Amino acid sequence: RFLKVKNWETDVVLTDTLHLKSTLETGCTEHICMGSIVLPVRTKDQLFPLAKEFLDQYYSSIKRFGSKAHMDRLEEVNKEIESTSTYQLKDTELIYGAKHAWRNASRCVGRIQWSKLQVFDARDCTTAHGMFNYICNHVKYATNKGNLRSAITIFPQRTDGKHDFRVWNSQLIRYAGYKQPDGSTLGDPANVQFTEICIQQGWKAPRGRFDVLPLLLQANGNDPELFQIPPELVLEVPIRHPKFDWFKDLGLKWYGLPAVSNMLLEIGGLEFSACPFSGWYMGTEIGVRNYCDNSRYNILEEVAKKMDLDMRKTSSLWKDQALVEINIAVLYSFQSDKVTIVDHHSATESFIKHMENEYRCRGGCPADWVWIVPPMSGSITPVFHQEMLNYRLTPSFEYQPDPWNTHVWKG
Amino acid sequence: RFLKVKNWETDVVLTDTLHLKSTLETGCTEHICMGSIVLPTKDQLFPLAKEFLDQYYSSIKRFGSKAHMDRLEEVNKEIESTSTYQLKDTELIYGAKHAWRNASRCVGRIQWSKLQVFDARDCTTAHGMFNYICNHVKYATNKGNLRSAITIFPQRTDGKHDFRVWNSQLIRYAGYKQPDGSTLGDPANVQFTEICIQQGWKAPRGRFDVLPLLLQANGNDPELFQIPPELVLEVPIRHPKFDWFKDLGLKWYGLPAVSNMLLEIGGLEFSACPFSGWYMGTEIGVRNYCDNSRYNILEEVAKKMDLDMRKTSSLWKDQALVEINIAVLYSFQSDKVTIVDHHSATESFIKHMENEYRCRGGCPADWVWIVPPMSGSITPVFHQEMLNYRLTPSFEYQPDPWNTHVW
Ligand code: HEM
Numbered sequence: 001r002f003l004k005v006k007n008w009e010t011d012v013v014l015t016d017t018l019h020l021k022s023t024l025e026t027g028c029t030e031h032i033c034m035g036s037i038v039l040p041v042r043t044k045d046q047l048f049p050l051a052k053e054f055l056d057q058y059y060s061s062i063k064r065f066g067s068k069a070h071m072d073r074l075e076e077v078n079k080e081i082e083s084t085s086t087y088q089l090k091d092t093e094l095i096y097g098a099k100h101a102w103r104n105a106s107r108c109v110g111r112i113q114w115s116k117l118q119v120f121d122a123r124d125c126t127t128a129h130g131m132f133n134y135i136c137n138h139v140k141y142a143t144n145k146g147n148l149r150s151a152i153t154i155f156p157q158r159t160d161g162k163h164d165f166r167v168w169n170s171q172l173i174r175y176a177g178y179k180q181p182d183g184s185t186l187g188d189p190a191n192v193q194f195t196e197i198c199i200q201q202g203w204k205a206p207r208g209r210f211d212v213l214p215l216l217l218q219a220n221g222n223d224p225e226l227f228q229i230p231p232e233l234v235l236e237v238p239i240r241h242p243k244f245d246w247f248k249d250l251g252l253k254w255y256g257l258p259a260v261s262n263m264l265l266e267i268g269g270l271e272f273s274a275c276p277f278s279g280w281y282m283g284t285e286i287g288v289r290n291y292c293d294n295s296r297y298n299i300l301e302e303v304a305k306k307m308d309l310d311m312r313k314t315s316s317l318w319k320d321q322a323l324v325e326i327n328i329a330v331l332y333s334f335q336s337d338k339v340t341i342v343d344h345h346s347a348t349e350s351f352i353k354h355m356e357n358e359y360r361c362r363g364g365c366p367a368d369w370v371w372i373v374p375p376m377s378g379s380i381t382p383v384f385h386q387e388m389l390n391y392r393l394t395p396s397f398e399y400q401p402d403p404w405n406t407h408v409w410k411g
Numbered sequence: 412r413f414l415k416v417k418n419w420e421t422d423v424v425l426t427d428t429l430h431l432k433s434t435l436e437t438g439c440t441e442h443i444c445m446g447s448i449v450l451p452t453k454d455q456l457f458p459l460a461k462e463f464l465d466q467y468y469s470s471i472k473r474f475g476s477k478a479h480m481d482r483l484e485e486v487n488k489e490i491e492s493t494s495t496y497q498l499k500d501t502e503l504i505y506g507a508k509h510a511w512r513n514a515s516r517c518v519g520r521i522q523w524s525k526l527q528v529f530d531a532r533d534c535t536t537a538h539g540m541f542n543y544i545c546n547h548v549k550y551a552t553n554k555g556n557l558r559s560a561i562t563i564f565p566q567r568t569d570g571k572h573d574f575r576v577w578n579s580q581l582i583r584y585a586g587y588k589q590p591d592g593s594t595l596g597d598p599a600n601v602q603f604t605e606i607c608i609q610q611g612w613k614a615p616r617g618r619f620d621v622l623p624l625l626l627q628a629n630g631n632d633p634e635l636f637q638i639p640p641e642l643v644l645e646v647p648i649r650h651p652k653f654d655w656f657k658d659l660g661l662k663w664y665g666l667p668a669v670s671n672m673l674l675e676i677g678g679l680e681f682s683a684c685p686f687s688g689w690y691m692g693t694e695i696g697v698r699n700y701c702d703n704s705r706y707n708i709l710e711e712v713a714k715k716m717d718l719d720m721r722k723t724s725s726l727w728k729d730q731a732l733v734e735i736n737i738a739v740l741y742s743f744q745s746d747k748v749t750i751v752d753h754h755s756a757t758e759s760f761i762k763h764m765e766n767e768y769r770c771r772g773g774c775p776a777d778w779v780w781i782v783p784p785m786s787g788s789i790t791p792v793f794h795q796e797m798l799n800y801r802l803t804p805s806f807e808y809q810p811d812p813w814n815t816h817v818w
């Protein structure tokens with residue numbers, strides 16, 4: 001069964017055959033669409049077919065489907081599963097898996113880069129200190145003095161779910177958030193809960209507006225431990241505006257390396273609960289969401305005052321105006337410091353090309369319109385006018401519950 | 412089976428039971444979501460009638476009453492007899508208001524109950540239709556103090572006697588393809604502008620020519636009619652800081668009056684039911700003016716502002732897009748023509764959502780359409796989880812008449 005998507009700006013029609021290889025559920029039914037819903041210990045019983053499907057995929061990709069190497073590998077995995085209840089991926093399979101998980105991430109606009117991913121195998125890691133070391137190396141390699149390089153570090157896979165490796169931080173580098181007695185928030189409100197945990201775990205908080213959070217690291221199902229990323233490894237960028245000289249006085253900065261660390265990587269049925277990965281920022285992530293979301297730094301007001309906009313009526317579009325200047329400032333600051341960033345026009349334009357290439361070479365490209373379209377200026381980017389089809393392929397990146405809600409404390 | 416939606420800005424969680432009433436299909440499946448896809452007999456009829464009458468009589472607190480049962484009996488008999496049936500005025504008004512109430516893509520639904528319904532089911536000719544439409548336009552315009560309205564033409568019989576308004580809106584600008592390769596006026600209307608000419612229209616070949624009406628009564632061939640200019644309220648577009656803006660020669664009409672949809676009530680089909688409300692600023696400034704496949708004026712506006720259009724990263728398009736949208740709102744408000752900005756409208760919709768969750772058990776909503784085409788995440792709807800599902804009465808898309816007309 002074939003499915004067509006239409007770009008309403010170009011009338012380019014594309015045909016999806018890849019959605020047929022999809023197994024996992026969407027949340028949607030014939031009677032309801034959950035397209036805008038944010039989020040809608042395993043036995044041998046289901047493991048081998050999941051392993052087999054992955055290995056069929058891998059061996060097709062390397063043009064060896066049906067080969068003796070293919071068959072022997074299938075046999076070998078089967079035996080290891082029934083003997084040990086799990087299996088180990090080869091390095092080749094791991095690398096292939098991680099890249100394909102990124103390729104399959106329907107909410108990621110940056111996927112044109114998917115084949116250039118540096119995979120760090122951390123499956124020999126055993127302790128939190130070991131995790132700290134690997135992560136430091138990840139940060140140094142990925143940052144590369146501002147010339148950012150996509151990377152992922154993969155810690156050991158889940159066994160019984162009682163020995164999980166987890167990075168408790170949602171991103172490797174994030175700023176602290178502190179709730180004040182007067183109800184106000186100092187720093188990043190998104191991080192208040194996590195900041196509190198760190199403080200409780202013994203972190204001495206400087207209590208500033210931009211304190212880089214410590215790493216909270218869990219190895220082998222043990223209680224997490226605190227570590228401080230060496231500051232010389234944390235690249236930051238002062239935010240100024242090219243024409244507005246007062247903008248620097250807002251005292252804003254951001255870190256250069258977006259490195260998501262709370263997701264779960266699924267490959268051939270194996271679960272990698274600690275797999276921190278990094279790319280580089282699209283400007284709007286910082287300039288629209290991180291600064292201008294009301295539940296975040298929320299600086300639209302102060303920026304608007306300083307611009308002397310008519311803030312009396314919303315129909316002056318003072319919010320829109322201030323939002324653009326902040327986003328201009330973010331891009332300017334990063335470019336000026338030679339730190340890799342991409343604007344939402346460039347990234348969406350690249351995504352469309354990538355998407356079309358994926359349709360031709362792969363039979364489709366699953367894409368979540370709700371997340372692909374940038375959070376400002378939607379319809380003046382070409383993704384807005386692009387019909388997309390959303391469905392789930394493995395290998396994949398999945399959400400997982402926050403470890404503090406599930407963890408069994410050792411003491 | 413009882414579904415929750417969360418607002419991630421406020422943590423407010425609403426619970427949806429209304430979705431369980433849904434009948435029609437979304438296009439999505441368990442394996443694939445089609446949320447961003449633009450277009451996904453007597454025995455059929457009586458359950459459809461029943462369902463509607465059931466909800467109508469429940470709405471007036473007379474569910475399971477003599478009046479209810481009688482009407483059910485009467486309609487059942489009339490279906491058995493006539494192979495169709497007619498709505499009571501009360502049912503017609505209720506049905507139309509609820510079609511709007513159910514329009515999951517409409518951000519303006521907080522106004523749903525205040526719809527003026529014009530029953531035009533006595534209409535027999537295109538001239539008649541023209542008269543009715545002129546009355547609608549005049550009433551809804553109200554000298555700039557716009558009032559929502561719908562005019563309902565006779566329901567489908569055997570699909571050979573269809574009433575249709577061939578225009579997609581009662582008021583739209585013509586589009587012409589030049590030999591020069593470009594396009595003058597509105598590119599979206601190039602084909603319809605052609606069919607007007609093919610049918611006998613005399614285009615002024617301008618840039619903002621109000622298109623004539625193309626009216627089809629009783630399945631007959633469509634006829635042309637020129638809306639009295641005095642009934643077409645237009646707004647010259649000027650910027651409250653940039654005096655050069657007026658030299659762009661831009662204007663827009665005050666009355667958005669969608670005329671190409673199909674109204675379904677109780678299984679009955681109204682192929683001709685033009686309706687109108689008032690504009691959200693972005694509809695004109697973002698989509699109509701700055702869409703590449705539309706007036707596409709971003710380039711020229713940017714130049715006039717002397718922005719560094721060398722690199723996308725200067726965000727010059729974004730800057731121009733804002734000012735353009737400032738100007739649209741400024742012009743309408745100055746001329747006292749009703750308009751709403753995307754902030755006010757989205758805020759209103761959140762309140763309406765909460766009202767509906769509170770008083771109806773939910774509110775079908777298509778995030779992809781509700782979130783405005785600029786400044787998305789600084790409007791409250793962006794952070795609002797929504798559930799999309801189809802309820803009846805409803806407005807539906809329908810094929811363009813020319814692709815279908817048995818001439
Ligand atoms: C290299 C430059 C990259 C750019 C510019 C980019 C861009 C983005 C953006 C803007 C989002 C939406 C984030 C949000 O609004 O919350 C996103 C989501 C996502 N990205 Fe990428 N990305 C890049 C690299 C990567 C890499 C290297 C990976 C993994 C190896 C990845 C995997 C994902 C996943 C799984 C999501 C969905 C997150 C979720 O479900 O909440 N991306 N990306």
Ligand code: HEM
Nearest residue numbers: 511514516517518519522559561686687688689690691806
């Ligand atoms: C009174 C003020 C109103 C406002 C501000 C408003 C706003 C909007 C907007 C912005 C859209 C998106 C349209 C687009 O991007 O093309 C829309 C769609 C829609 N509106 Fe409303 N509207 C109003 C009144 C009405 C009325 C009176 C009706 C019917 C009686 C209606 C029915 C619909 C329907 C069916 C759609 C979806 C059409 C489609 O699927 O393309 N609206 N509305």
Ligand SMILES: CNCc1cccc(OCc2ccc3ccc(N)nc3c2)c1
Nearest residue numbers: 038258260262263278279280281282285
């Ligand atoms: C539930 N949504 C919030 C949430 C929770 C957990 C991870 C996450 O990731 C967003 C994300 C993921 C990967 C990215 C890679 C690069 C980049 N510039 N941004 C990126 C942003 C987002």
Ligand SMILES: CNCc1cccc(OCc2ccc3ccc(N)nc3c2)c1
Nearest residue numbers: 449667669671672687688689690691694
């Ligand atoms: C599918 N998009 C094109 C298309 C086809 C058919 C109807 C339609 O109408 C959109 C629409 C409908 C009703 C509206 C009422 C008020 C308003 N300001 N805009 C409105 C916009 C739009």
Ligand SMILES: C[C@H](O)[C@H](O)[C@H]1CNc2nc(N)[nH]c(=O)c2N1
Nearest residue numbers: 036037038370371793794795796
């Ligand atoms: C409710 C809604 O689904 C939610 O706010 C989503 C919308 N689209 C998004 N898109 C991106 N890229 N990132 C996000 O966090 C969100 N949030």
Ligand SMILES: C[C@H](O)[C@H](O)[C@H]1CNc2nc(N)[nH]c(=O)c2N1
Nearest residue numbers: 384385386387447448449779780
């Ligand atoms: C491809 C995509 O579905 C298309 O551009 C949609 C997206 N959202 C929209 N939203 C509104 N309000 N109006 C539209 O015409 C569209 N078009």
Ligand SMILES: [Zn+2]
Nearest residue numbers: 028033439444
């Ligand atoms: Zn869906």
